[PDB]
Symmetry: D2
Subunit: 329 residues, 4 copies
């Protein structure tokens, strides 16, 4: 008898029920991981990346904190077999923006990495929801959908969940109210062509645009457009300051994971196919409000846009589609 | 009138009530910050460091995630006025040991950095608890205590809380039991010379040493002593693989912050001024199990140690004192 | 020496920092208590009531679950000295209406009861926020205000926070969307005479009244008016089925406590002094959206109401003032 | 089209972490609220025979949905509402009346469980059963016999609460949080439970080694009275408020957390103990068990003194003396 066999009588000689994989152990990947771990969303966490040392080191560092977590198994490996049986696979790997660089400048590189990553994910977790975080997220969500063969409910991009969170933060600062009570939606591209939906902004269901008709216009004496300009510029400013962004996106992704894993059916602005709305007929992916739960995106909310908002959203779709349409698979 | 005044009728025109400061926004400081944020331990978090762009970028990145948090105020700056009225001030800043640098010279460089940091902390939060996380932690805890002029109860080193968490992770992995139910205490000097207290190692109050009398000796067929060696060497391996450790330390610190901020009077093995115990006769800080609460360390547990355990604590104390006695304050 | 002194060396020989008191240990009082305990809002919980057996039993039962909580001190007694230094005191005690007793006489009995409770609360926690949960809440919040001598930011009635949560539950059931994503506000007097603000009802900032102009009217083929009718009748139905309500009130009250204790500045529809809105000239308390934080109600939202909505609030205000002016303090 | 169709464009048409609570008395509802506030389930079902009370409790919980993260709460007298539960927690049954023998009380619960348990098994054949009804060690056996489940899926709440109470009282005496005051109460829940003095420790320091009289009648400090108070505390609460609820609910939610999240923490729960401590009969008593996704996967074999071991054997004999008389 070993010490274990003297101490413990074994009765039972099972897959995880709530496994999540994070692909990519860069700063974004690891912020997603710690955020998911601290939210108790998974019974198993797997990490995958191509840099073996860094991957192992990250895994071990999380494991050493196990005592303080409620996720009893953390694994990693360059081989996708460690990701088998995931309910949710979060893809953060690939090139990221350098100072001053457009997320759209990342397309060729990250499409080529997705050509390797997505078939491997799909092979080991054929029923997962895919949550794409890598940039440009809207384009890569389309790509992941096309490569995976998944129905589109199961391919979700982090999209404008973060842009909307930034927007509500800044709104909150101007009004003196917690972001949880400042409502406003940013839709379209997670990037420079995003669309603030001024007509929907409210606190306690009081329309800000009804109170302030010039809201969001160039004529606005309070220059509320500058809030959206700051939303657009946020990642660039943070990158210039600390080299990359990580915490906000990690929190946003864990917010999405929470709705998925706990089947909440909360609404979030995430990247999905919008064909059929606003007279768009192209297979373009961008953010609109979607109901998120255990089957991914189960429904879209049809937002009532002003003609100016709709035009902006159409411009966003045209910019994204002009890229997506030329991709070769 | 402004949109704000049209929307909102002000009744009242702020002293922080549950504030935590983190000094140093390297990987350790930010892991402490995110862990504290995700455990809802503070109503205000202040970040301070000397590199202003990086500091602002970290702050902004955390603020952009505010929607997903319950800590409504996040501030930063090089000026310690941002830290005023902290209940708890966590010090992670300092110099890293260079190739060829003696331990004595490294500590002296950290003394010189502490002579700027500590009096600034003390000026703005004179009644805080100081929690030192910078390496080498036991010596820098002494440094902070001497410079601050604080009573012993309010100067705490992170010490062996992380070593014991690592130990319990490794134990759990061996026994197939969650670390929460695998008990064991690593005491003394953090890291290389720490002491595993084999007599206290247990599951459900069943003493493993009693069940397996070779436990923790060279001759043990199951080489349980390897578990402690792995705790010591775990860090080395993580450093060699990813460059540094961060996540486990962050979670360890947030565990300590939880007991302090919530006045839990849980017991943790943290570094405290131990002159008076164990035949220790110098002003050194070593980990023993301490009751932690709103006044810092209020009580400590007198662990019964074997002759060999006691000798190893004394050797550490002599070694620490041997460096401390050479420092220029 | 004793066992404790052999085990523990004492360093220091305590004011609670985040203490909450619940007055009244009926079902509502105890549901507030468990809800607060399970949200880790307090470092000390005090219970007070006049029925000494039941009070001690409730206290002990909660104490027996301390292992599973993070509120290290739970106390109780008939004497208000156990309430000292509370940040928040939650009042759930009050009269039951008698057959044939006028609403005026009933409120007068609560005045006389509050003339005992409130000055004893004020003696031991002069700087607390008072949260009145007792029915009829709007008038009892006025009574507490008048007896306490507190400024009006520190006297808060639970008001329509529950009514709005019910409304959102029912909305979410009809739409297949989590109530967190179904926005809508019920204002004015809690319960029978509450006002649903149809203009504010929305998902992702999309106004349902705009999409469906008959919303809230008797002309509506979908009878959305029945949602509010169910909000009003809900307590009646739950009372007929189980004898009383408790759980929802507890959870609602814990939501309010969270904003106050953590200084969140979230907006909640709670009872506050609304003299000067809506052509109301009297010292009456009714629910409007209020910003809640560490100083209680700091601000209120001026909701644009329809002529009918406004007239309903004014009518509640007139009825309340008709009673209040005949009370003897 | 309908408002709902004008607002929402539908793309898509089984709960994955579902819990059922059987019985909506004080204990059942305390379990329900504790489970809801710990976010352990994506669906909660409630079942009892008293339909008004059941519906009222369901609605009162539902009205709190905004504040919870359990998006579906259902109830009914028909066990079809409990389909596909991972964990079914049984709190229903008869309470012992004036003049009633233990045997007859148990039989009355056998007759109730003959309805409840097969209904549970029909709709959630792969669930774990957690028996909370009193006397728990015997009714766990009853549930096991009626269900036909393997031993690992039939768990009694057992001494998890006794142990929590003991650590509360130990903590009060020492001025340390219960989380840092370790000690295990085993065997039969309640009156005949056994405090294992040898495992009582703070930070791995054995109190018994420091204080050899610990747990003996000789003890100047009367530490035996801490265990007496564990037994008597319940009687006291019952005398004061009429019943106990909150602590049972928190204890049961602690067990459910380990099961639902596959934590493999160790808890002292009621499990079939035949083959230990000289016990040869099919009886359930509390020992420390590893709890996870498949129920009880492993038992910790605590080293007991002869006296402690005799007390469990006596309990086993008494339990078996009752069980052999029951009519299934
Ligand atoms: O994760 C850890 O456990 C960790 C990370 S760094 C770390 N260190 N660092 C020293 C250290 C640092 C500078 C010195 F001059 C020195 F002599 C030692 C000791 C540790 O135990 N330990
Ligand atoms: O859940 C609820 O919404 C609820 C439970 S009781 C409840 N009440 N209770 C009164 C009430 C209670 C005693 C009185 F003397 C009285 F004049 C009114 C009004 C409510 O709206 N409302
Ligand atoms: O909170 C508790 O700890 C508690 C509440 S009831 C409770 N009981 N109930 C019995 C019990 C019930 C019926 C019987 F026929 C019998 F012989 C014993 C034993 C407990 O230990 N214990
Ligand atoms: Zn919200
Ligand atoms: Zn523990
Ligand atoms: Zn180290
Ligand atoms: Zn009511
Ligand atoms: Zn009992």
């Amino acid at each position: 008898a070993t010490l274990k066999d003297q101490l413990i009588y074994n009765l039972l000689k099972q897959t995880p029920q709530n496994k999540i994989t994070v692909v990519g152990v860069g700063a974004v990947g690891m912020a997603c991981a710690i955020s998911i771990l601290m939210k108790d969303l998974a019974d198993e966490l797997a990490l995958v990346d191509v840099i073996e040392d860094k991957l192992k080191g990250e895994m071990m560092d999380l494991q050493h904190g196990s005592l303080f977590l409620r996720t009893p198994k953390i694994v990693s490996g360059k081989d996708y077999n460690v990701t088998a049986n995931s309910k949710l696979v979060i893809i953060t790997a690939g090139a990221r923006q350098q100072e001053g660089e457009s997320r759209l400048n990342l397309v060729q590189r990250n499409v080529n990495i997705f050509k390797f990553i997505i078939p491997n994910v799909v092979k080991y977790s054929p029923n997962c929801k895919l949550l794409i975080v890598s940039n440009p997220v809207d384009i890569l969500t389309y790509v992941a959908w096309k490569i995976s063969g998944f129905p589109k409910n199961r391919v979700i991009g982090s999209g404008c969940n973060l842009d909307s969170a930034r927007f509500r933060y800044l709104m909150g600062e101007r009004l003196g109210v917690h972001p949880l009570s400042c409502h406003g939606w940013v839709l379209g591209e997670h990037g420079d062509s995003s669309v603030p939906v001024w007509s929907g902004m409210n606190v306690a269901g009081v329309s800000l645009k009804t109170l302030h008709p010039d809201l969001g216009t160039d004529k606005d004496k309070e220059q509320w457009k500058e809030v959206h300009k700051q939303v657009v510029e946020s990642a660039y400013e943070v990158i210039k300051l600390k080299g990359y962004t990580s915490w906000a996106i990690g929190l946003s992704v864990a917010d999405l994971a929470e709705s998925i894993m706990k089947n909440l059916r909360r609404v979030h602005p995430v990247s999905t196919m919008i064909k059929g709305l606003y007279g768009i007929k192209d297979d373009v992916f961008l953010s609109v409000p979607c109901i998120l739960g255990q089957n991914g995106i189960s429904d879209l909310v049809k937002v009532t846009l002003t003609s100016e908002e709709e035009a902006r959203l159409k411009k966003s779709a045209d910019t994204l589609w002009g890229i997506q349409k030329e991709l070769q698979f």
